[PDB]
Symmetry: C2
Subunit: 115 residues, 2 copies
């Protein structure tokens, strides 16, 4: 599993469940092409987005639909989405965990990169 | 000053100085058109991006060039940039401060919306 996303809710102290996200990859003409998508499970995790063979070097964008998450909880949040843009696999294959901790007016994001 | 951006450095415990950023407004065709830009001051702040008359309701993106900041310090970063995408909404008088706290592999962003 070369790309995993984990989302937590800082208001409830819980995984953020059923959060949709779309992953894009920058094409040679500098446009964002669709790459993968999914939603978080009961654990707040989204696994299985890609494979080692498909997840080539490139610039990737993870767009996490945080606004829909908060709206369903009755909250009108600040951000439209949380965006995570990064170069992947520039020194060979790595495994990436993208993590996001969500509040209505704030989010924090980090990455855990392992070889 | 309806929109200000403040950037801090979590490795050095200091304002993040000379950080470049661009602000975009989402257009009718779903493209991002340039709106304003600048670099943070010695206090880590960027003032004077827009005026109350120009800062109408809509979806705005602040793209902060965090990669160049870390590169200038000789530190290898994860993100290409930090992206803050939000809707501006007229609910009485509002001033927006977008704040970002930067680490090489993580950032946190919040909004302080005041009257
Ligand atoms: C979305 C996950 C996450 O994002 C953060 C942002 C922060 O600033 C501080 C903490 C977190 C955080 C975690 O608590 C967390 C991460 C992993 Br990885 C994990 O396995 C488990 Br359990 C918990
Ligand atoms: C309480 C201030 C604060 O706490 C954080 C926690 C985070 O994880 C990330 C960022 C912040 C953060 C700021 O960016 C901030 C700092 C100053 Br100083 C300031 O004047 C303004 Br406005 C905003």
């Amino acid at each position: 599993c070369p790309l995993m996303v984990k989302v937590l809710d800082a208001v409830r102290g819980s995984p953020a469940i059923n959060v949709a996200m779309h992953v894009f990859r920058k094409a040679a003409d500098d446009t964002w092409e669709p790459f993968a998508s999914g939603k978080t499970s009961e654990s707040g995790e989204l696994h299985g987005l890609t494979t080692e063979e498909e997840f080539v070097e490139g610039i990737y964008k993870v767009e996490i639909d945080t606004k829909s998450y908060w709206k369903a909880l009755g909250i009108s949040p600040f951000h439209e989405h949380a965006e995570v843009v990064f170069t992947a696999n520039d020194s060979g294959p790595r495994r990436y965990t993208i993590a996001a901790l969500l509040s209505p007016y704030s989010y924090s994001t980090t990455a855990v990169v392992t070889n």
